[PDB]
A paper describes a structure:
Ribosome assembly is a highly complicated process that engages more than 200 protein assembly factors (AFs) and many snoRNAs. The maturation of pre-60S is coupled to the dynamic association of approximately 90 assembly factors, hierarchical incorporation of RPLs and sequential processing of ITS1 and ITS2. In this study, we determine the cryo-EM structure of pre-60S at an early nucleolar state.
After three rounds of 3D classification, 98,155 particles were selected to reconstruct a density map at an overall resolution of 3.65 Å. The most striking feature of the structure is that only half of LSU is present. Therefore, the structure represents an early assembly intermediate before the global architecture of 60S is established. A total of 12 AFs and 19 RPLs were modeled in the map. Seven AFs Has1, Brx1, Ebp2, Rrp1, Mak16, Nsa1 and [name] were newly located. Rrp1, Mak16, [name] and Nsa1 form a cluster bound to a junction region of domains I and II at the solvent side.
Residue numbers in the entry:
A (entry chain E): 88 to 220
B (entry chain M): 261 to 267, 351 to 396, 403 to 433
C (entry chain D): 55 to 105, 127 to 322
D (entry chain H): 31 to 51, 71 to 305
E (entry chain M): 88 to 173
F (entry chain K): 69 to 119, 125 to 235
Write the structure that this text describes.
Amino acid sequence: EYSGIIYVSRLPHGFHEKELSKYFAQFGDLKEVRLARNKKTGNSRHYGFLEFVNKEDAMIAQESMNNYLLMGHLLQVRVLPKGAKIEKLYKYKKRVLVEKGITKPVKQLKDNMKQKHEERIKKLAKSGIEFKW
Amino acid sequence: SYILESRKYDSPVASLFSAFVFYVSREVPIDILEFLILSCGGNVISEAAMDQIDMSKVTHQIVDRPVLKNKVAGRTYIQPQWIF
Amino acid sequence: FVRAESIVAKTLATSREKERIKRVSILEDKKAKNETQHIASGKDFILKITEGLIREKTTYDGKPALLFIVRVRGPLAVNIPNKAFKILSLLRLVETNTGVFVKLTKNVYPLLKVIAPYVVIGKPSLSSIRSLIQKRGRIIYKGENEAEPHEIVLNDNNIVEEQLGDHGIICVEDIIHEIATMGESFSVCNFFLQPFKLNREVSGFGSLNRLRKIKQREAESRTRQFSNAATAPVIEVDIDSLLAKLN
Amino acid sequence: AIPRERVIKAVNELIKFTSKPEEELKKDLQLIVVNNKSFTGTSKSFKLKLLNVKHSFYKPWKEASATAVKDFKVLLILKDSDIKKVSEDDLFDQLDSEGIKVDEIICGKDLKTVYKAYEARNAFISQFSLILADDSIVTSLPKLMGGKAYNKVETTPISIRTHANKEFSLTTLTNNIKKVYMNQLPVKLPRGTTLNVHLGNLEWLRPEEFVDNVELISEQLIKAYQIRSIFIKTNRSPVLPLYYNQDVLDELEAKK
Amino acid sequence: RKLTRALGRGEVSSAKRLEENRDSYTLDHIIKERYPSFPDAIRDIDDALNMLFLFSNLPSTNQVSSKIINDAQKICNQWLAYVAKE
Amino acid sequence: LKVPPTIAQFQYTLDRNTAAETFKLFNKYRPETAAEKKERLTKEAAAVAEGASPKPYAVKYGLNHVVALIENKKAKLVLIANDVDPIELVVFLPALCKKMGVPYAIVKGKARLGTLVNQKTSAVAALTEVRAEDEAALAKLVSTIDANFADKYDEVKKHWGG
RNA sequence: CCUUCUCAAACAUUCUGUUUGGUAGUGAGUGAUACUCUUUGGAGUUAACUUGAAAUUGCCUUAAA
């Protein structure tokens, strides 16, 4: 027997849990709505998972919408086998750069410039191709 | 409005104020203002026109306010009802 | 019914507002502080469009001058966002098609770019003011009766003088100088007036009427512009004849 | 700075490293790498740069690629209303003098309509290399061209100020496409600690061009941006030293 | 029925066309038939000055159509141009 | 009464939405009106009378013409009404396109097709080569009629209805 | 059933010239080379590739009734 959840792919831009829950509630109040968003550069992965109340609500909403078309996108939506356990994909965002540096004085960092460049000329010396500086 | 171009008055009930003009405030009644001053020779100057922002031959004035504070010398006052 | 399309539609519309005004506020950040290091331009403008379409650019650099405000719908797809909805809420222009005067100083000026894509705007003329008040305006008044959650047409000079006894004002044509030549603070004149509800230019849902409805969708969809740049200069038009029609 | 003979032994002995026997187009490209403390901070900025160079590797890119597989060719983007003003056969009378001719002059209107559909898009832009645009639109290009073709300094548009003052007329397009052509090598200034300008193709003119290029560019950008260390390679290469500057290094301690 | 016809289908262009192709009739025969010639015209007009000036007052709403207002007021100003100049 | 499998394949049509989309498309393509041709040919008439032609576009709607586009094969999608006075006329299209691998689509009403074409009726209106603007909307559209109509409706081929 | 930041000042008067600014993406994945970093926290950056806007679980109401 299948699951109560509905897999949804093909999710256009401007279609999120506002719109997900907003629309799909018409099939009954849904337990869960998740949209798979991007770890950075905030936007989605264009698919998400849902679950409503009972298997029947999933029947209704799915089959009603399974091939439904919108904007440029026809939305392939279908249930899953027993369970399938929506787990992960928390709401993400675009996590801004945190800049810590540079705690050390030019001692070890300008050193590591030195030793790193010296051993660099070592590296090109292994190539081997002979340079200077 | 309406410049009127081509191609004796009531003898003599109208055609009064021969080369003679009036001034009116803003406060003078708006629906009735230019009527007989256009129907009997002369000018109308409303302070309302100066809300865009003459005052020379003016003698008679018109104020419907309860009071005028203060007057002006060379201007011989009348209420609006005078025009009647 | 939801009409699921409509859902996403509103959404994207709303987004174009947010990201717009947000940018605008950051411009309002760097035109507040003159904190500019690298920006587009620190100078604002007004885009003056008149009528085949003859245009030009200026800058307001006030010099307080009244903008005339006529609200008409747009852009039809959008849920009001916060800051727009409030900055209007001052001008109470929701329940749309509400015409109002607003004096524009340079503390009035930059707050416009939020209102830009809503009301159509332009310096009025005399006969537009006198003619627009002479046919409209309403006063909320109490006396002798009337606990009154009710609005009164403008006739009675008793209320004219009476409520204007503060400023020593009779005869709302005094307010004309208070407005046309922009009298003291100007404010209680218009707050007084409880500003205006236009009749829509052409009524709707009829046979021949539906034509005119389309023609309006045409010209209204052209002459109403935007940048959406946060550098968007304001749009100004000649509203006089517009109010020969609308009022 | 810097010694001539250093980068000259690096470029000739580099011709040694490329002397050993698409993939070729991968190998032979000579790239100039440059670093610093940090590049311009906490802003993704797509602004490009017009470099002043000894000459342009455009013309060698053309002639040597006239037989190539990719066969690059030219674009430019006009504004809305200038399109009908400047025809295609207008601007052909002129550009020829330098041996350089555009193909197609389109409106972003057409990018937003016919050239959307991201496969129709990326397949329409990916067959190019050198790009043009106009500034006034370039501000609007981020959303239209989309997150793909800004991944190549190739495809990301150069900007230009085409419009004249006021009411643009074509003369400045005629001479100013030459201006954007002959002396200038656009280059991009991303975030991070690292930028590698894409320089040239080895099979083009003798190192006498390339070494001077290295000079003018190198000391050019050294000035303003206070770089840390500078390298050169051929697309693949373990880096080649030229100017190792620890002087301005200590500026790290200046602010911190 | 034609405009609701095409417009029922579509074809905005057609609708425009009909919009021009139509015309409003000319009253004028009855002005010469009913009030010949000059004086009979003057006769009752004052009844039309009542409404001319009333409507030329009126604030614009629907079933007013500020056009009507505009010609009304304009011919007020032309009438009063004829008396006030008269 | 029981109706043959080759009938009752009408009565299965496109939904509110998909139809709505199809007309979102074609309403771009209205074959120009008569007064239109009179327009352009009058203006050019005066032009070349005193004082460079991209291939025009429309939907190709002649029934004979339409079946002519098919069997070549040319067309891309075909719209077929559900009501023809001699219901005979169209009975073979849904088979035909079938065997020829053409995206046929049943859209309800002959007034509804007839109105996009500047006629009173069509019962068949179809297009093959389209401008590049909507080419994607086409590929997806036909993908939608495949997916909606075509997919689960193989059943209609058997099963006397009624 | 949505429609896209299509320009600025400055400088010098030349049918144009000079100069500084102004631009955050559909996503998915291929990837051999580096830079840089900081205490494992792997962070920002490095050639150039495939793609039907493809998929699976990286903690205001007159655009009504």
